Amino acid sequence: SLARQNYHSEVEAAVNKQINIELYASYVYLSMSFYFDRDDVALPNIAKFFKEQSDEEREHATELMRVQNLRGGRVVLQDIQKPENDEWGTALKAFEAALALEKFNNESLLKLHSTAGNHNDAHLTDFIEEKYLDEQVKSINEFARMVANLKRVGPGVGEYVFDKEHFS
Amino acid sequence: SLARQNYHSEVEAAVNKQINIELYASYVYLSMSFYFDRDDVALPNIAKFFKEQSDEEREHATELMRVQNLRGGRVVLQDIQKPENDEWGTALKAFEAALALEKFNNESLLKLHSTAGNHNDAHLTDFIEEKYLDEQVKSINEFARMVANLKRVGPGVGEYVFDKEHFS
Amino acid sequence: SLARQNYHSEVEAAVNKQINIELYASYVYLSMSFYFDRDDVALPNIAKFFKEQSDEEREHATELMRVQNLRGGRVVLQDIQKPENDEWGTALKAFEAALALEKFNNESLLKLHSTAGNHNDAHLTDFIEEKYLDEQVKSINEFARMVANLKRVGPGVGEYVFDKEHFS
Amino acid sequence: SLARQNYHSEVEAAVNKQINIELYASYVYLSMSFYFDRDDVALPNIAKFFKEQSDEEREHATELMRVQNLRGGRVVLQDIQKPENDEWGTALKAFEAALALEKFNNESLLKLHSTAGNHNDAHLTDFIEEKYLDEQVKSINEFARMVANLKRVGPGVGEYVFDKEHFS
Amino acid sequence: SLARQNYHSEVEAAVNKQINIELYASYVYLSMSFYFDRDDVALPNIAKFFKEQSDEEREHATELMRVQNLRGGRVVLQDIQKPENDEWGTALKAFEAALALEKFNNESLLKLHSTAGNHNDAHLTDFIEEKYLDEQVKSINEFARMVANLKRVGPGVGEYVFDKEHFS
Amino acid sequence: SLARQNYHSEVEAAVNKQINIELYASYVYLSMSFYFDRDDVALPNIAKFFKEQSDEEREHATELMRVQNLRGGRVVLQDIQKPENDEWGTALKAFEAALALEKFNNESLLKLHSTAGNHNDAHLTDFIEEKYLDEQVKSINEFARMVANLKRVGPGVGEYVFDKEHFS
Numbered sequence A, B, C, D, E, F: 001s002l003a004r005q006n007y008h009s010e011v012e013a014a015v016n017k018q019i020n021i022e023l024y025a026s027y028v029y030l031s032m033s034f035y036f037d038r039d040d041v042a043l044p045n046i047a048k049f050f051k052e053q054s055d056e057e058r059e060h061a062t063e064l065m066r067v068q069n070l071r072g073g074r075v076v077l078q079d080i081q082k083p084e085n086d087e088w089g090t091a092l093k094a095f096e097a098a099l100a101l102e103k104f105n106n107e108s109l110l111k112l113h114s115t116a117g118n119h120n121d122a123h124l125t126d127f128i129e130e131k132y133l134d135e136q137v138k139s140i141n142e143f144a145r146m147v148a149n150l151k152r153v154g155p156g157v158g159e160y161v162f163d164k165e166h167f168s
């Protein structure tokens, strides 16, 4: 690359690892979205919410691919593993699993930021701080509030009222 | 008929049978609609929904009459039997009976499609596949989702919330 | 019913009888509408007219069901008999049979009004007078004028001119 | 062709045969259109109708040429034979000859559909069913209704009234 | 499932297999899109085209998941394999590999249609014919035309002119 | 014909001959249009141009039929011969063959004008001069300019640039 400058190989490898992590999270959210679309579950606003989350994680992966091309590195793709479960239980269990996934993703992003800071890469630490860390903190807070409200309303008619009211 | 071509008599008889089946389904949905309009039941959005379903089944019967005239056959009408019940119980029992009626209608439509396929009638198999089979699959899925939500919300205030929220 | 007041059982039975009469008239007009849609008859404006008449008779039956629920009675449905003929001859014969059907319906409505008057039911006699008797008189007059014009124009080109001009 | 897949040579030959049949039908309708434009016949709306029918048959032939190029086959054109008659008699005789031509075309289309079904060509059977069979059934029904109305109105002033009224 | 009717398990397994095939094709097109985004390749309209193709294949996979839920089956997801190459050579080699991928996908779709036809599943054969087969034929034709034009213009300034002109 | 005046039979026969010549030219241009639509040729603007030329030649033939009916003659149609080639080579060879066809048509039109002038038919010589001769001269000039530009740009990328630029 004629454009490559102050971009070490360890940082390039860590960016490729984060790309695979974002693609796996997108595929997990797609699985959850079509679990709540089943005819014996039938909570359509929750399914639409998880479909939007899947699209957002795919956008995160493509923006990391774009900055990898911008700095003069090379994108190397790996296999995307299938999700851990085919069915996700009640709505409370699914939102708790989603919260755990968001926290795992936040820990991976902080490790990537630490590697880029150790190799004195100012542009990439600023990129990560501007586009990923604040969005991840807000996503974790949103899922924690939804878990608290699902614990409040309880099963049955509270779950129906939550599906009708929380996403409009 | 000057227009009749590749239209056997068995297919004509099966089309007349399907016309009577659609008219019976319309009259059953009219009975359900005015059961939920009673002053001691008083669920108006469910009653409006079943009135719309009755109008839709009448439209299905008239479109079958129109294609019978289009192919050069002759419409032969029979008696329309009264519905099996005068009162339909709770909302869950009524929607379960409606789901069973939709599945019976789907089985009759598949038998008509099989007869038209056995007599090498390409236009009528394409007509049935385009206008009836996909609509019937979507109707069965809609009634199954409504049965699942009525099992979720339970009786009483859940039934009131279902009547207020599900059809708007 | 908590709402029932000054509504005797004989009046309720007569209202159910009138409901079945209106549904039978709707099904007769549907048969006439699809007779004139045949490819060897081919008078489309007459067929559209009889389709509108069928929809109107269905509306009459549903309004009687609504007032039965309003007064606190219970709707009891019966079988709908098939029409007397499959084919209706010339246009003059069909309009004469339609005129005879309208006069039969008017005689049934007058008998219902007489029963409600004998049982001192002021609301139902006023309902019948405001919604059914004047409309029935106007319908009989319209069919008599159409029979007179069909006798005037004669068969053939007069029938074609009648179909093109009378309903626009 | 780099695009050819699951497209046998017998199906290609049958598509070329159907192209020639549609072009012949277009040229027959052009002959009828300019017969009714003569100064001793002078029925202008019938002539305009047959001109539109000629344009429609030319569109059918060009859409078959387009799907032949789409599947990777090669278009092979043949001579277009002249129509059987120079003059077409009365309006009733011309519309009866047009009805016979439409039924011949429908029989050829059903034979093409049968060949494509015997060679397990799913895309072409769906193409024929979607774009040609229903349109052909509707065209045959339209010509049969016009023959019935021309028999009704008779010669002379009925023919003039038919030309003035039926196409507006 | 309360909605499942005339839906055998072999057809369900074949639908899950086709879902995995569409997801793999989407990931291959994403790899091609970010190959042409590199700073030493720099053909931006080709990269935008392959990004749109990746989004379209993802939409195909989600519509198959939706019809699997509609018929009462259960979605079972598998691993998505990484693409065969990291870099795709010249533009002609990349479009030839894309054409081969589209033809492989068409062969898989025809096998799925054959299985659904062997198990007498009328709704699913009509669904596949309406939504997938014609689109696949048009996609194969589009890629074959692009391969022919890339062979015509040659390398260098012809490749630049192709990137500037073909997608606007 | 009541309208025929100063219209000899030789002029009528020459008009019928010119009608057949225009229809043959239309069918040749249709063959060229679908040659350039092939997936291994793929020059879409040239194909659209030849489709428009085919429609224009059909309009020329129908206007000659109209003036034949206007003067009180009778249209007599003949067979339309198939074109000389199924495939037309490069773009330069196809445009050279089109130029030769236009010059043949111009020679036939001048012979028709000479016959009408020899029989002292003032209206038809004015008709031919106003509607056919100037249009034919402009068409020959347009095809000669396109042959000169196709010789200028050469094969390959020049042919691609010609297809992209010359018709917009």
Ligand SMILES: [Fe+3]
Residues within 6 Å of the ligand: A022, A025, A056, A057, A060, A105
């Ligand atoms: Fe993310």
Ligand SMILES: [Fe+3]
Residues within 6 Å of the ligand: B022, B025, B056, B057, B060, B105
């Ligand atoms: Fe129905």
Ligand SMILES: [Fe+3]
Residues within 6 Å of the ligand: C022, C025, C056, C057, C060, C105
């Ligand atoms: Fe009435």
Ligand SMILES: [Fe+3]
Residues within 6 Å of the ligand: D022, D025, D056, D057, D060, D105
């Ligand atoms: Fe046609």
Ligand SMILES: [Fe+3]
Residues within 6 Å of the ligand: E022, E025, E056, E057, E060, E105
């Ligand atoms: Fe796809």
Ligand SMILES: [Fe+3]
Residues within 6 Å of the ligand: F022, F025, F056, F057, F060, F105
């Ligand atoms: Fe010309």
